[PDB]
Amino acid sequence: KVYNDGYDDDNYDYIVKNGEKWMDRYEIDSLIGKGSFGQVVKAYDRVEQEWVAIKIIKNKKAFLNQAQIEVRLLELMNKHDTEMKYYIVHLKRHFMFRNHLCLVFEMLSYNLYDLLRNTNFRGVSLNLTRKFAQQMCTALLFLATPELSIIHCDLKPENILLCNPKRSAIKIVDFGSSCQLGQRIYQYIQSRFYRSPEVLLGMPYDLAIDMWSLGCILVEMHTGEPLFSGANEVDQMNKIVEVLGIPPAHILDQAPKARKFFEKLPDGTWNLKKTEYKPPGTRKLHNILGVETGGPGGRRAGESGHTVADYLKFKDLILRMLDYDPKTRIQPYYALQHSFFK
Numbered sequence: 010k011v012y013n014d015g016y017d018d019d020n021y022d023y024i025v026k027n028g029e030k031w032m033d034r035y036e037i038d039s040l041i042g043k044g045s046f047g048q049v050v051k052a053y054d055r056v057e058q059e060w061v062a063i064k065i066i067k068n069k070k071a072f073l074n075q076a077q078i079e080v081r082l083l084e085l086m087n088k089h090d091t092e093m094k095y096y097i098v099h100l101k102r103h104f105m106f107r108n109h110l111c112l113v114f115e116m117l118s119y120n121l122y123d124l125l126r127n128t129n130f131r132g133v134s135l136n137l138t139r140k141f142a143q144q145m146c147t148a149l150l151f152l153a154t155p156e157l158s159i160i161h162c163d164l165k166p167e168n169i170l171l172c173n174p175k176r177s178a179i180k181i182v183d184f185g186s187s188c189q190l191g192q193r194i195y196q197y198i199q200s201r202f203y204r205s206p207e208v209l210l211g212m213p214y215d216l217a218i219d220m221w222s223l224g225c226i227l228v229e230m231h232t233g234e235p236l237f238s239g240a241n242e243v244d245q246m247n248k249i250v251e252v253l254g255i256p257p258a259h260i261l262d263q264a265p266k267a268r269k270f271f272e273k274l275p276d277g278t279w280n281l282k283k284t285e286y287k288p289p290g291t292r293k294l295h296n297i298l299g300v301e302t303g304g305p306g307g308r309r310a311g312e313s314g315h316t317v318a319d320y321l322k323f324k325d326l327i328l329r330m331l332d333y334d335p336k337t338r339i340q341p342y343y344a345l346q347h348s349f350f351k
């Protein structure tokens with residue numbers, strides 16, 4: 010009949026009313042997001058005199074504990090990044106309000122998916138793409154700090170926000186899927202389109218999965234459409250194979266889930282199972298990017314910084330991010346020294 014003395018709905022969510030003031034401090038403006046965790050509101054901090062994004066976690070033990078896991082990782086990252094130059098969203102405070110854990114973040118702007126929607130999924134320039142790429146690579150180098158060793162585990166355009174709607178600076182959000190490098194506990198991880206081959210194949214993984222995800226993201230930012238839009242894992246892996254070919258044999262011989270996608274022939278070589286798809290490696294990135302045809306769909310023909318030479322540098326960096334082998338896949342430090350950023 011009544012939940013949390015009337016403050017909650019039947020689904021454990023705080024009922025957000027515009028104009029409330031929590032603790033004589035946070036003036037609640039409006040709802041700016043929601044999900045299974047709970048809600049996100051726009052609120053004015055009266056003490057600090059600034060807008061904030063406040064994440065109100067559901068009044069439910071399971072979501073409360075997952076939120077505290079993220080708080081620990083956010084506070085751990087704040088100790089290593091005062092001055093805030095490695096592009097991770099700043100958690101500035103948390104408190105309990107009417108049996109809800111409230112996490113106070115800095116107010117950011119639109120996410121990179123919204124931005125893509127605003128271009129009607131036709132992409133943004135190689136110049137803006139490069140700026141995002143550098144910041145994201147720098148951010149991955151900071152996660153790679155030995156004392157952190159944090160896998161985000163869910164990089165995608167909706168989890169990268171602009172700081173200011175009129176600047177190109179970005180921050181990474183949502184460390185709810187994130188963990189520190191350790192023994193393998195989880196196997197169904199990452200959002201399908203940005204899922205890495207080692208995770209699809211059921212194999213050991215590390216911080217390299219985030220670099221795979223970044224490769225996929227950057228091509229999407231420039232094209233507008235996801236690179237590998239699988240409706241299921243078998244479709245996902247087939248779309249990777251269209252572009253990058255059959256994975257190397259030394260990987261597939263290890264893979265527990267290889268037979269979900271492939272068949273080991275009597276001579277010990279691998280090919281696809283029948284489920285449609287272009288032959289292996291015949292949908293070349295070179296043509297998806299439009300290297301010699303004026304970029305994706307010809308729309309960058311004659312734009313500054315979209316020459317063939319510029320496109321081959323972008324292509325080369327991306328193919329290093331989409332290495333099937335996570336041991337030889339490009340790492341943050343050397344991605345930053347790639348010719349694409351000079």
Ligand SMILES: O=C(NCCN1CCOCC1)Nc1cccc(-c2ccc3nc(NC(=O)C4CC4)sc3n2)c1
Nearest residue numbers: 041044046062114115116117118119182183184185186
């Ligand atoms: O909660 C998030 N995603 C929910 C889905 N996750 C999927 C996997 O893990 C479970 C949760 N992302 C997230 C996490 C922490 C902080 C924020 C955050 C920070 C600032 C911010 N600013 C926003 N919007 C604005 O300022 C204005 C409207 C443009 S949205 C927003 N979100 C987002």
